[PDB]
Write an enzyme that holds these catalytic residues in place. Structure first.
Site, short mmCIF file in Angstrom:
data_model
loop_
_atom_site.label_atom_id
_atom_site.label_comp_id
_atom_site.label_asym_id
_atom_site.label_seq_id
_atom_site.Cartn_x
_atom_site.Cartn_y
_atom_site.Cartn_z
N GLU A 80 0.85 -1.19 0.00
CA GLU A 80 0.00 0.00 0.00
C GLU A 80 0.89 1.24 0.00
OE1 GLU A 80 -1.94 -1.97 3.36
OE2 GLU A 80 -3.68 -0.70 2.94
N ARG B 217 -7.54 -3.02 10.84
CA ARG B 217 -6.40 -3.69 11.42
C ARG B 217 -6.06 -2.95 12.70
NH1 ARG B 217 -3.39 -3.13 5.66
NH2 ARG B 217 -4.50 -1.14 5.90
N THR B 218 -6.22 -1.63 12.65
CA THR B 218 -5.95 -0.74 13.78
C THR B 218 -6.85 -1.07 14.95
OG1 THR B 218 -5.22 1.18 12.45
CG2 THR B 218 -6.08 1.63 14.65
N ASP C 293 -5.01 -5.21 3.81
CA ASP C 293 -6.15 -4.40 4.22
C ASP C 293 -7.47 -5.19 4.20
OD1 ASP C 293 -7.53 -1.21 3.03
OD2 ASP C 293 -7.62 -2.22 4.97
N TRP D 297 0.24 -7.37 6.31
CA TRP D 297 -1.10 -7.62 6.83
C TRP D 297 -2.03 -6.91 5.84
CZ3 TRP D 297 -2.94 -6.66 12.58
CH2 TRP D 297 -4.31 -6.94 12.67
N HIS E 192 -2.16 2.84 13.86
CA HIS E 192 -2.84 3.20 12.63
C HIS E 192 -2.45 2.30 11.48
CE1 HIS E 192 0.08 4.96 9.81
NE2 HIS E 192 0.62 5.70 10.76
N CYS E 193 -3.06 2.56 10.33
CA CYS E 193 -2.76 1.86 9.08
C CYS E 193 -3.19 2.81 7.98
CB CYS E 193 -3.41 0.49 8.93
SG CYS E 193 -4.35 -0.14 10.30
C1 LIG Z 1 -6.04 0.15 9.97
C2 LIG Z 1 -6.48 0.36 8.29
S1 LIG Z 1 -7.77 -0.14 7.99
O1 LIG Z 1 -8.70 0.39 8.94
O2 LIG Z 1 -7.75 -1.57 8.14
C3 LIG Z 1 -8.34 0.29 6.42
C4 LIG Z 1 -7.57 1.07 5.51
C5 LIG Z 1 -8.06 1.44 4.21
C6 LIG Z 1 -9.36 1.01 3.79
C7 LIG Z 1 -10.15 0.23 4.68
C8 LIG Z 1 -9.64 -0.13 5.97
#
Ligand SMILES: */C=C/S(=O)(=O)c1ccccc1
Length: 282
Positions: free
Chosen positions: A104, A223-224, A170, A168, A216-217
């Site tokens: 990403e 994932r967060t 998305d 990991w 975060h991500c």
């Molecule tokens: C922590 C990223 S995320 O919430 O998993 C996410 C990022 C982009 C689009 C959808 C979810």
């Protein structure tokens, strides 16, 4: 049954009504609003709760689930980098957990700057990234660690421990074994850095809005949220905190998407059952 399909269906039902209720309406009073036209939200529909916003120009929120305090945010936009680093520095961040994949980040179409793996200058702030250790989490999931040193003229130089799970994908959930291993690593990393500040008598110790792990991500809601949930469940102070409580608190404190996919909720359910932690509230 407490963890039976009937119980799971009820939990899912309650959370769905909550997500729909929390959905942001245009000019929503509950959500932080952009200024002058400059983009604030990476995704128009994944917004930042105003009451718990960290900075007026970041999509980021202070989150407290039970006794566990953290900060959850979206991947900073290039234009927010400076303010982002400022947040990280002022927070004396004990650990920065990034769950956005290397793919990403590499895809320039996404606008996710390689801010923690590369050294550079942003405005008046200069950042250095030192690669440290690599830790396997199981199932082939890898945690790459770095030391992010943030320097700015006239400001105290701050170094931040980074935990990056770069593989990991998305909108998916890694196993409960991997999630527990990750939450343990993140908390452990945070405890080491926080202890350092406390040994130095840092004034940040008396400020509850500081020394919080930053997670975060890309959007910071899947994932967060999964990691945060796992982290709060590892806190020996959150006895009786239910999954319903857990997810509803993250949602009211950031946005209604927190714990985006059912597969991500299932991991939290599984971890709950493992501890004998209740799913629903009586
Ligand atoms: C922590 C990223 S995320 O919430 O998993 C996410 C990022 C982009 C689009 C959808 C979810």
């Amino acid at each position: 049954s407490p963890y039976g399909p009937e119980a799971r269906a009820e939990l899912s039902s309650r959370l769905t009504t909550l997500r729909n209720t929390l959905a942001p309406a245009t000019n929503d009073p509950r959500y932080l609003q952009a200024c002058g036209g400059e983009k604030l939200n990476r995704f128009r529909d994944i917004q930042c709760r105003r009451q718990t916003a960290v900075r007026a120009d970041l999509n980021a929120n202070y989150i407290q689930v039970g006794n566990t305090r953290t900060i959850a945010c979206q991947y900073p936009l290039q234009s927010q980098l400076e303010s982002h680093f400022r947040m990280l520095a002022e927070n004396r961040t004990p650990v920065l957990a990034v769950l956005a994949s290397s793919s990403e980040i590499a895809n320039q179409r996404f606008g996710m700057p390689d801010y923690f793996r590369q050294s550079g200058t942003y405005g008046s702030i200069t950042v250095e990234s030192k690669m440290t250790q690599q830790v396997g989490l199981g199932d082939g999931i890898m945690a790459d660690m770095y030391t992010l040193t943030i320097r700015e003229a006239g400001q105290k130089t701050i170094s931040v421990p980074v935990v990056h799970v770069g593989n990991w994908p998305d909108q998916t959930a890694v196993s409960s074994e991997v999630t527990k291993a990750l939450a343990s690593l993140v908390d452990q990393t945070a405890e080491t850095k926080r202890n350092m500040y406390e040994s130095k008598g840092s004034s940040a110790v008396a400020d509850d809005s500081k020394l919080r792990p930053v997670i975060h991500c890309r959007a910071g809601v899947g994932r967060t949220a999964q990691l945060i949930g796992a982290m709060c469940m590892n806190d020996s102070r959150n006895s009786q905190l239910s999954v319903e409580d857990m997810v509803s608190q993250m949602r009211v404190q950031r946005n209604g998407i927190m714990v985006q996919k059912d597969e991500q909720l299932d991991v939290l359910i599984k971890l709950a059952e493992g501890q004998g932690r209740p799913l629903l509230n009586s």
